[PDB]
Amino acid sequence: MHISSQQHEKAIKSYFDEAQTQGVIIIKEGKNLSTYGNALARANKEYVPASTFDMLNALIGLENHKATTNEIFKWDGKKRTYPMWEKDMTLGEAMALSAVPVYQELARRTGLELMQKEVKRVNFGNTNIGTQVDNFWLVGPLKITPVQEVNFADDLAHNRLPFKLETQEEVKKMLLIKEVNGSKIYAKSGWGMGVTPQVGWLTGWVEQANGKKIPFSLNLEMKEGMSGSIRNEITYKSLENLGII
Ligand SMILES: *C(=O)[C@@H]([C@@H]1NC(C(=O)O)=C(S[C@@H]2CN[C@H](C(=O)N(C)C)C2)[C@@H]1C)[C@@H](C)O
């Protein structure tokens, strides 16, 4: 409580400065939105959601019975970009591994028509998915702002999205990435590689010991030959600098 806001700002900026990237982390305490980082103006610019869209993809899928919690999506046995994707998995493992081929399977089962209306219903980002049901979150035209992303995380953390409570829980249980100091961090990472320049995301929330939920959204530029870890390390440093974890 004794650290100056000036100091918080400078430390969080330096986290981004030390990664030699440009980015912003938005944090929501209650209804108050706070913007940090070394590139504050990214806050209301639009980027592709990339794998962040998996969270909505899973909500849509599960709500409309295109899959279940336990269903095993079989690997077709073709080569994948990463060897860890060359196995059979649930939605939940696909979420942790960011296995897009699974989420494309789920997008295909949902179908363009049902995807468009469901993404209009949820009012996610710019809400346009175009005509290609299997890559619209990767190369456009679906885009969203860091502010919009943290508000979606807030919505999801609090069960406010227009989906069943069981659906929202099922997807939330897939999102645990770290336990720290009796705080749980639930989030989804994102690395849009099919856009110039590349966008990195880590969107989610901290659930504190006491019970309050603190949504955040990190968003930065990835320069190829940069580690995906940086998204986590910057987020964790920021949340700890602000005493959120
Ligand atoms: C989603 O944005 C894309 C995938 N998302 C991520 C990510 O968010 O980190 C990756 S990276 C992939 C997942 N874990 C692998 C890894 O770190 N090891 C090989 C150990 C790499 C994808 C680019 C999705 C749309 O492709």
Automatic annotation (TrEMBL):
N6-carboxylysine modification, residue list: D54
Keywords associated with the record: Hydrolase, Plasmid, Signal
Pfam families in UniProt: Transpeptidase
Protein name: Beta-lactamase
Gene designation: blaOXA-33
A molecular function GO annotation: penicillin binding
NCBIfam families (alphabetical): bla_class_D_main, blaOXA-24_like
InterPro entries in UniProt: Beta-lactam/transpept-like (IPR012338), PCN-bd_Tpept (IPR001460)
